Amino acid sequence: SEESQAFQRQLTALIGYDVTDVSNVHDDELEFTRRGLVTPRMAEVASRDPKLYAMHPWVTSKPLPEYLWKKIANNCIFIVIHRSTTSQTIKVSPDDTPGAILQSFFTKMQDFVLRVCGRDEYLVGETPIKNFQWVRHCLKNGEEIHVVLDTPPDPALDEVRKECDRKFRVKIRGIDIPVLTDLTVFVEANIQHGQQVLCQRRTSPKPFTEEVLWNVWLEFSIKIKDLPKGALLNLQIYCVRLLYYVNLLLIDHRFLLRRGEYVLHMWQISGKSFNADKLTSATNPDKENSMSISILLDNYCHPAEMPNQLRKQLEAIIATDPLNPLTAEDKELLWHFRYESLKHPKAYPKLFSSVKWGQQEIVAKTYQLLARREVWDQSALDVGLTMQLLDCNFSDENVRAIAVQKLESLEDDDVLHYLLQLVQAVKFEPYHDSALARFLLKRGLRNKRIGHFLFWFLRSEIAQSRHYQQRFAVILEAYLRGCGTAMLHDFTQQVQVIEMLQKVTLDIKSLSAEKYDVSSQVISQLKQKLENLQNSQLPESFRVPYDPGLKAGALAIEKCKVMASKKKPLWLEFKCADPTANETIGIIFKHGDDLRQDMLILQILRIMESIWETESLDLCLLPYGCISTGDKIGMIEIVKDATTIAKIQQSTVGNTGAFKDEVLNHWLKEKSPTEEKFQAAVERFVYSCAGYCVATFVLGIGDRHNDNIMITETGNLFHIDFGHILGNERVPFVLTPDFLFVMGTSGKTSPHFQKFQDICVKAYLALRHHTNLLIILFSMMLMTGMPQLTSKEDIEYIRDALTVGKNEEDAKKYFLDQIEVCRDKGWTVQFNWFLHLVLG
Ligand SMILES: COc1ccc(Nc2cc(-c3cnc(N)nc3)nc(N3CCOCC3)n2)cc1OC
């Protein structure tokens, strides 16, 4: 269809990849998935309520924080309402439905609805107004709720376009590389299931040349019948170091044994190791420069009491952390007692790791074992436990499915919290179509906020990842067909803006080189280049990718500028597109840093906050919006009235930092109109400082330069630029005499310092109860998100930091000890960091 191809071509530009391209595939798996996702899509599009979907209400079922309910006081809430005239305030009960409030507003005066001024947000459906996330946000900021009486959006804008017992063996013919001194080479063939190697065979070393021919049958111990679904054939070339690797599913999406001739273009590695890239079933799209290996496959297949002491033995095995390796005896015990182990959900990840997947009999029993789901099905949802089963350790679709089952109950605000990690978890899936993928698809189509972030998280991987881009493109294309024409329009104009600006970002960086800072000609060029973009192409308005609630209008070209960083990032400001708002929308465009890392780190910060909320703790973290738009390129939210802690020192002392503890406090008063807001700043600081002290310490990002820490004029302090630190005289975290001086302590105790410690302890202990969740989120992040090869060692930093197994008291002191390490060297580390900046 003429108009059907233009619609597909439209999808291609939004996706950033062409899913109609079969050039890179040795089979139909991707295409089979594109069609497979057709059903679960149209099913969700038909399920969602048009009105609620159009207004995408953002709500939470979580209990109101214990500290905030105190703010409720009289049990009355002030809510302002304006249409063109009326400023009149109406007092409503916390449990009152927005609709019932209209009936109350119709009495003082329904086809009209309540919207939030300056943003696109709607209070709608039946939920208590206390359950609306945006409302809770105003309270925490000590802000009054301002709502505009408005007409509901037309749901018609959301309409979607009409739609053998023999042993296994493989013949290695040879390898070929287009181009390159007397070296040696051999191929390694592994049969892998969930990172576990079932059988291994290597060829005989042959002289390394542009072509090497073997034609040898590599025979394996494993029988064809014993091959578990999701099993990978891992082919690896060896120089004794690994050169290239490629993967082929021995059993396809159709449950068929893979058969016939295959020529696979492999991936090249980097020598100096857990990486999600090594798992990909995708062949290298570049056939020009990539090594290839030819193989042949021909196999014909059409298809009660537990002794007290041992109980104590596995219970301890169940109780150990996710990163605790299971010994041989560990697994045998778990398995023989599996029916007992099935009563403990927390033991599942370890139990299914005790399964021998290279045996059909065992796998079958494993299914008989899953046949009784009672304990698991009825158990309270545990994310850290659920996600544990979604990682690289499990290739079995049925095992992974039970995890996806639990996720079904997360609803909306929890999905957003874990959305990023879940999207990354797709890389662990053996097949393109999967329960997890279908889960993400459905949830994205059901909610616009979840769908918006789904879009960008997928585009991020599609752009900079040649390994998973094909699978993700297929998933994104699926979503784009069900999201409606309105969103398709929003994404379109968001993508245009992003492309125009990135071009400017890179063109600006190419000048001024690495150093020498900013030329007057570089300032001018940007000013001109922007007005040239504002002239024609740039959309009159666009939705802010990291905050879809925000609609950005025309640029402020006078407010824009190039930053002093050696990476010459852009500082951009847009006028608010919504007339019901003055304050501009700040955004930073940077190249040369990998913002996928920043992205992941920031998402964990938001997760730590949620944990602290249930514990009735508000640490005032400031997880600013960050979106990776491509390779070493992306956008960053600008927190208003915020400056670096380094600039505050230079504003007083001078070029190179020397002491001056008092400077910190001096700045806070200067930026405080009234001591009332100064004492409020000190309060905001002591909490925020505590938050980032505990959070950063756990993630191992605790030790940072003075220039990577910022503070708002209102006292809120927050870290930035998490990209390099994870790969690059340590200090547990940053705690400085200048920070202490604001608390009243000098290298000695103060009322605020005691407050500080009590906060840290309560915050640090509240995380340890979640220890497993943090461990798996952390390890996953390293595997999917860290280009630098993640090892068993790096992932184990968070085990020590969280003091696993240590007494809650023993841990309480352990953290109070880390604080003591800070005062021991006050400026020592920061002074070296300042010395490290020059060299070297
Ligand atoms: C007031 O002075 C400055 C204020 C900020 C910066 N630089 C950066 C640098 C970065 C940054 C963030 N992420 C990464 N990867 N690299 C850099 N982010 C910000 N902001 C984001 C949060 O809201 C505040 C702004 N600012 C530099 C300054 O002087 C050189």
Swiss-Prot record:
Residues 556-827 form the PI3K/PI4K catalytic domain. Residues 562-568 are annotated as: G-loop. SUPFAM superfamilies: ARM repeat, C2 domain (Calcium/lipid-binding domain, CaLB), Protein kinase-like (PK-like), Ubiquitin-like. Residues 700-708 are annotated as: Catalytic loop. It comes from the Eukaryota. ATP binds at residues 586-595, 621-629, 718-726. The keyword Cell membrane applies. One of its GO terms (biological process) is neutrophil extravasation. It is found in: Cytoplasm; Cell membrane. Residues 719-736 are annotated as: Activation loop. Residues 304-482 form the PIK helical domain. The keyword Flavoprotein does not apply. Residues 74-151 form the PI3K-RBD domain. Changing K590R: Loss of kinase activity. Loss of autophosphorylation. Reduced inflammatory reactions but no alterations in cardiac contractility. This is Phosphatidylinositol 4,5-bisphosphate 3-kinase catalytic subunit gamma isoform. It comes from Homo sapiens. The lineage of its organism: Eukaryota, Metazoa, Chordata, Craniata, Vertebrata. The gene is PIK3CG.
